[PDB]
mmCIF file of C-alpha atoms in Angstrom:
data_model
loop_
_atom_site.group_PDB
_atom_site.id
_atom_site.type_symbol
_atom_site.label_atom_id
_atom_site.label_comp_id
_atom_site.label_asym_id
_atom_site.label_seq_id
_atom_site.Cartn_x
_atom_site.Cartn_y
_atom_site.Cartn_z
ATOM 1 C CA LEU A 1 84.731 106.288 99.582
ATOM 2 C CA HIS A 2 81.682 106.658 96.981
ATOM 3 C CA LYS A 3 82.054 105.991 93.034
ATOM 4 C CA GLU A 4 80.156 108.979 91.037
ATOM 5 C CA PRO A 5 79.568 108.735 87.263
ATOM 6 C CA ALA A 6 81.005 110.726 84.925
ATOM 7 C CA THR A 7 81.642 111.245 81.248
ATOM 8 C CA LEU A 8 84.976 111.589 79.320
ATOM 9 C CA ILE A 9 85.262 114.880 77.721
ATOM 10 C CA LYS A 10 89.069 114.591 76.776
ATOM 11 C CA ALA A 11 92.466 112.841 78.295
ATOM 12 C CA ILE A 12 94.895 115.343 78.717
ATOM 13 C CA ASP A 13 97.819 113.184 79.671
ATOM 14 C CA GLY A 14 99.083 110.236 81.432
ATOM 15 C CA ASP A 15 97.992 111.650 84.990
ATOM 16 C CA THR A 16 95.038 114.278 83.716
ATOM 17 C CA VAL A 17 91.835 113.595 82.311
ATOM 18 C CA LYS A 18 88.979 116.167 81.719
ATOM 19 C CA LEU A 19 85.467 114.886 82.709
ATOM 20 C CA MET A 20 82.209 116.028 83.106
ATOM 21 C CA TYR A 21 81.025 115.616 86.641
ATOM 22 C CA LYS A 22 77.700 116.740 88.266
ATOM 23 C CA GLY A 23 77.011 118.640 85.107
ATOM 24 C CA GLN A 24 80.085 120.521 84.501
ATOM 25 C CA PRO A 25 83.461 120.508 83.049
ATOM 26 C CA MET A 26 86.512 119.686 85.534
ATOM 27 C CA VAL A 27 89.985 118.476 84.919
ATOM 28 C CA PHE A 28 90.851 115.371 87.304
ATOM 29 C CA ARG A 29 94.458 114.898 88.419
ATOM 30 C CA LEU A 30 94.884 111.072 89.104
ATOM 31 C CA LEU A 31 95.680 110.595 92.705
ATOM 32 C CA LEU A 32 98.765 108.747 94.119
ATOM 33 C CA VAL A 33 100.490 108.262 90.982
ATOM 34 C CA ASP A 34 103.563 110.007 89.683
ATOM 35 C CA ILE A 35 103.992 109.774 85.863
ATOM 36 C CA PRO A 36 106.638 110.893 82.895
ATOM 37 C CA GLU A 37 105.035 114.218 82.421
ATOM 38 C CA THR A 38 104.294 115.202 78.749
ATOM 39 C CA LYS A 39 102.597 118.612 78.965
ATOM 40 C CA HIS A 40 105.434 120.454 80.348
ATOM 41 C CA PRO A 41 107.345 123.438 78.914
ATOM 42 C CA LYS A 42 110.885 123.013 77.991
ATOM 43 C CA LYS A 43 111.077 119.524 79.145
ATOM 44 C CA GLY A 44 110.727 117.603 75.817
ATOM 45 C CA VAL A 45 108.170 115.363 77.232
ATOM 46 C CA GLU A 46 109.548 112.274 79.472
ATOM 47 C CA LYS A 47 110.721 108.871 78.807
ATOM 48 C CA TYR A 48 107.667 106.513 79.048
ATOM 49 C CA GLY A 49 105.435 109.612 79.333
ATOM 50 C CA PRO A 50 103.841 109.226 75.813
ATOM 51 C CA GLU A 51 103.236 105.593 76.622
ATOM 52 C CA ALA A 52 101.564 106.651 80.207
ATOM 53 C CA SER A 53 99.604 109.219 77.823
ATOM 54 C CA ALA A 54 98.425 106.565 75.444
ATOM 55 C CA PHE A 55 97.734 104.217 78.047
ATOM 56 C CA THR A 56 95.421 106.497 80.311
ATOM 57 C CA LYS A 57 93.837 107.596 76.835
ATOM 58 C CA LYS A 58 93.208 104.382 75.749
ATOM 59 C CA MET A 59 91.847 103.075 78.843
ATOM 60 C CA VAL A 60 89.227 105.671 79.434
ATOM 61 C CA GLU A 61 88.376 106.484 75.448
ATOM 62 C CA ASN A 62 87.162 102.702 75.135
ATOM 63 C CA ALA A 63 85.426 102.538 78.315
ATOM 64 C CA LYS A 64 81.460 102.056 78.560
ATOM 65 C CA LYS A 65 81.474 103.926 82.011
ATOM 66 C CA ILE A 66 83.679 106.143 83.851
ATOM 67 C CA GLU A 67 83.517 106.641 87.498
ATOM 68 C CA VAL A 68 85.509 108.875 90.030
ATOM 69 C CA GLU A 69 86.025 108.388 93.501
ATOM 70 C CA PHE A 70 87.254 111.325 95.582
ATOM 71 C CA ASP A 71 89.490 110.535 98.583
ATOM 72 C CA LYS A 72 88.509 111.652 102.093
ATOM 73 C CA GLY A 73 91.141 114.266 102.179
ATOM 74 C CA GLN A 74 91.480 117.759 100.020
ATOM 75 C CA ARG A 75 89.481 117.081 97.018
ATOM 76 C CA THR A 76 91.232 119.765 94.663
ATOM 77 C CA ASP A 77 94.731 120.981 94.232
ATOM 78 C CA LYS A 78 96.265 124.811 93.909
ATOM 79 C CA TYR A 79 95.345 124.426 90.119
ATOM 80 C CA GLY A 80 91.702 123.817 90.604
ATOM 81 C CA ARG A 81 92.118 120.138 89.738
ATOM 82 C CA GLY A 82 90.121 117.478 91.281
ATOM 83 C CA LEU A 83 92.206 114.605 92.986
ATOM 84 C CA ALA A 84 90.360 111.602 92.369
ATOM 85 C CA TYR A 85 90.798 107.868 91.696
ATOM 86 C CA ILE A 86 89.191 107.289 88.081
ATOM 87 C CA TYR A 87 87.496 104.175 87.031
ATOM 88 C CA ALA A 88 87.052 102.678 83.417
ATOM 89 C CA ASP A 89 84.476 99.920 83.394
ATOM 90 C CA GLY A 90 85.104 99.133 87.136
ATOM 91 C CA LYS A 91 88.860 99.014 86.594
ATOM 92 C CA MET A 92 91.058 101.669 88.176
ATOM 93 C CA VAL A 93 93.232 103.981 85.914
ATOM 94 C CA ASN A 94 95.524 104.667 88.728
ATOM 95 C CA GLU A 95 96.510 101.009 89.717
ATOM 96 C CA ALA A 96 96.876 99.844 86.303
ATOM 97 C CA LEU A 97 99.051 102.818 85.414
ATOM 98 C CA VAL A 98 101.103 101.412 88.385
ATOM 99 C CA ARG A 99 100.664 97.877 87.845
ATOM 100 C CA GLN A 100 101.912 98.306 84.171
ATOM 101 C CA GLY A 101 105.255 99.946 85.302
ATOM 102 C CA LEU A 102 103.993 103.327 83.757
ATOM 103 C CA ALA A 103 103.960 105.401 87.012
ATOM 104 C CA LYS A 104 105.581 105.303 90.391
ATOM 105 C CA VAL A 105 103.431 105.541 93.620
ATOM 106 C CA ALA A 106 103.628 109.220 94.711
ATOM 107 C CA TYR A 107 103.846 110.760 98.380
ATOM 108 C CA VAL A 108 100.423 110.834 99.854
ATOM 109 C CA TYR A 109 99.044 114.104 99.342
ATOM 110 C CA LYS A 110 96.610 116.246 102.293
ATOM 111 C CA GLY A 111 94.993 112.828 103.703
ATOM 112 C CA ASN A 112 94.451 111.234 100.364
ATOM 113 C CA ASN A 113 95.695 107.639 101.089
ATOM 114 C CA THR A 114 92.844 105.057 101.074
ATOM 115 C CA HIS A 115 94.264 103.146 98.136
ATOM 116 C CA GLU A 116 97.886 103.670 99.049
ATOM 117 C CA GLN A 117 98.524 99.879 100.032
ATOM 118 C CA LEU A 118 96.723 98.641 96.920
ATOM 119 C CA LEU A 119 99.173 100.922 94.767
ATOM 120 C CA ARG A 120 102.270 100.166 96.550
ATOM 121 C CA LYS A 121 101.569 96.219 96.019
ATOM 122 C CA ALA A 122 101.032 96.732 92.391
ATOM 123 C CA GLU A 123 104.142 98.771 92.428
ATOM 124 C CA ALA A 124 106.301 96.390 93.726
ATOM 125 C CA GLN A 125 104.881 93.649 91.216
ATOM 126 C CA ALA A 126 105.897 95.686 88.357
ATOM 127 C CA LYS A 127 109.205 96.506 90.083
ATOM 128 C CA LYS A 128 109.870 92.378 90.171
ATOM 129 C CA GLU A 129 108.529 91.992 86.598
ATOM 130 C CA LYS A 130 110.942 94.763 85.499
ATOM 131 C CA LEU A 131 108.139 96.411 83.478
ATOM 132 C CA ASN A 132 108.476 99.769 81.462
ATOM 133 C CA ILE A 133 109.982 102.109 84.195
ATOM 134 C CA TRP A 134 111.634 99.416 85.993
ATOM 135 C CA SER A 135 113.129 97.936 82.539
#
C-alpha cells in the first residue's frame, strides 16, 4: 500500500473526515472501524459517539501531516466516500480509535483488509483494559 499526502478540510465525525486529496475536496470514511454514529437522523447521537468524534477531530486538527492510504479493495462506497486508512503524523487514526476503545473492528469490506489483524489486536487490548465502549 502507498501513503499519499492530504490536507485537513474538516472532520465530520469519529469515522468521517473531509480532505483535499490530489487537489480536490473529498470525504473519507475510516476503513474497518465501527463507531457510535453522531451524524444521524432520529438517533439522538450515540453513547461514546461524541467522544469518538472529538478524538478523531483532535487527532487530525492538531496534526502536522495528514496522509491517506487506500487499501487494495474497492476505494469508494455507494455514497462516493473514499475508503481509507488515515494517518496523522505517522499514527493511524483507525488504530488509535480502536486501541482507545472508541470503535469496534468492522466486518471486512470488498477486499479491504490489509490492516485487519493489527486492528483486531488493538481491539483485544482495549477489551482487556475495559476501555470506553468496553467499560
